[PDB]
Nucleic acid binder design. Structure first.
Lengths: 50, 154, 98, 100, 50
DNA sequence: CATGGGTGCGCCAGACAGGG
DNA sequence: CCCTGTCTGGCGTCCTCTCACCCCATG
């Protein structure tokens, strides 16, 4: 829902879900591109922490 | 012999990280210890001394190397894995895909109101560069002409 | 250059079909040359009716055929958009040649 | 007329559309204008081992329900009374009595 | 968004019984999904349970 | 325009080492 | 293995009434 002004005051769960989906899309694209080992380890580790 | 390594920067300031890295090299004049810098990850041709490691992590807006450990960080999976990743990105931009429709063959539409619809090419026109395919819209087949790039081969 | 051919039998059901597709295109694209018809098409067949004799009982039936062509003038990305999976006339064959 | 003659057409449609509906070059084109050596004569030698019932010359367009040989019409695939059997009870669209 | 954190087809229509924009603005065909917009056709609290 | 990353609390309690 | 020290977690009253302010930043 927005506030008086009009800027949408967004919830925290939307930040969390949007982070997980951004990272998951990045990880699918790197497994498409066949990135090396350390790149996809950091990518999956960032998804795990997300 | 200089082997490759992966550097993590603040994603978005990557060109400025690359420029500041070249400038820190030409400041602290370890010119014989750095080969190139390729572009959120920055590829660096390098050797491993602890002095050069402190140099790259003292470059601003750089988090650190990405490897097995932080004592002796890790080169790469393949010899030129950084170059392979760059080539894969370039091939990804090109995105060459099966996109056509010939007589007696199902095709896919991804352009115009008929996008997200499949159909078959009853007639083909290589001279006019147009495929005659109909889309099952509200049941009735909707024979429409689509270009090879306008539709994908099914 | 964009053709909307409509293929059916009777003119007493296609008559509401030429009304629904020029006006719904008017609200979205407003770019049409108007319905230009085609000559009415007749399929008459005389057939024998007596079960085993008498080559005189020939009763004339016909499966009648009609064709009407809409021909919107400009490839509109709003007429086709709103009238893609949409056709009021039921039991009809639509041919949206784009 | 008979279930056996209607049992002929299910055998007829089967083995004909095993060879002589799709494979047409071996039966038609292979004896066109080429040399009159006996190799295209050898081509029609293989045409004897197949069933001669499988030719499209066998094609008898029958009533799908009762199998009547004479008095047929291809526009409905029916016998000459079946087109009235849908004319008088409306099972075929547009089939109106020609009142001309 | 077409298919985002806040989709139409995956969850439901924001407005009650309104599909999306130009489709179904009365109470007759509750359910049809036009290609014009991949969207469900239900009430306003249907997204809270989905 | 849209995305991308301090240093003043105190007790209980059980799990994890660490001697013992 | 039997006791001893450490290391992290889990927790701390209820109703109300105003106020002020909610992501830069930028090629």
């Amino acid at each position: 829902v927005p506030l008086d002004g009009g800027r949408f005051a967004t919830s925290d769960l939307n930040d969390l879900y949007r982070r997980v989906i951004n990272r998951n899309n990045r990880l699918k694209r790197l497994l498409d591109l066949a990135a090396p080992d350390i790149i996809v380890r950091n990518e999956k580790r960032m998804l795990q922490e997300a | 012999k200089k082997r490759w390594y992966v550097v993590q920067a603040f994603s978005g300031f990557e060109g400025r990280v690359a420029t500041s890295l070249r400038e820190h090299i030409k400041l602290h004049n370890m010119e014989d210890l750095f080969g190139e810098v390729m572009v959120g990850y920055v590829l660096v041709q390098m050797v491993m001394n602890d002095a050069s490691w402190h140099l790259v992590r003292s470059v601003p807006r750089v988090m650190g190397f990405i490897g097995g450990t932080s004592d002796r960080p890790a080169p790469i999976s393949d010899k030129e894995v950084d170059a392979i990743m760059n080539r894969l990105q370039q091939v990804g931009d090109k995105p060459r895909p099966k996109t056509l429709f010939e007589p007696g063959e199902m095709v896919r539409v991804n352009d115009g109101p008929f996008a997200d619809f499949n159909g078959v090419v009853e007639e083909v026109d290589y001279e006019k560069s147009r495929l005659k395919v109909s889309v099952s819209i509200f049941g009735r087949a909707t024979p429409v002409e689509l270009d090879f790039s306008q539709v994908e081969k099914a | 250059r964009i053709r909307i051919r409509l293929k059916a039998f009777d003119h007493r059901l296609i008559d509401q079909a030429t009304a629904e597709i020029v006006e719904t295109a008017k609200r979205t694209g407003a770019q049409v040359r108007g319905p230009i018809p085609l000559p009415t098409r007749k399929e008459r067949f005389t057939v024998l009716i007596s079960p085993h004799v008498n080559k005189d009982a020939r009763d004339q039936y016909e499966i009648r055929t009609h064709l009407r062509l809409v021909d919107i003038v400009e490839p509109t990305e709003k007429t086709v958009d709103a009238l893609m999976r949409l056709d009021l006339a039921a039991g009809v064959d639509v041919q949206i040649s784009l | 007329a008979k279930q056996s003659m209607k049992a002929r057409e299910v055998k007829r449609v089967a083995l004909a559309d095993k060879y002589f509906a799709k494979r047409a070059e071996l039966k038609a084109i292979i004896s066109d204008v080429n040399a009159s050596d006996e190799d295209r004569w050898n081509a029609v030698l293989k045409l004897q081992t197949l069933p001669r019932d499988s030719s499209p010359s066998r094609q008898r367009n029958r009533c799908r329900q009762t199998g009547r040989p004479h008095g047929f019409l291809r526009k409905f695939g029916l016998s000459r009374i079946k087109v009235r059997e849908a004319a008088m009870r409306g099972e075929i669209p547009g089939l109106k009595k020609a009142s001309w | 968004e077409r298919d985002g954190l806040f989709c139409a087809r995956i969850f439901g229509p924001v407005k009650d019984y309104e599909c999306l924009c130009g489709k179904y603005k009365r109470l007759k065909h509750r359910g049809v999904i036009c290609e014009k917009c991949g969207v469900e056709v239900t009430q306003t609290k249907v997204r809270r349970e989905r």
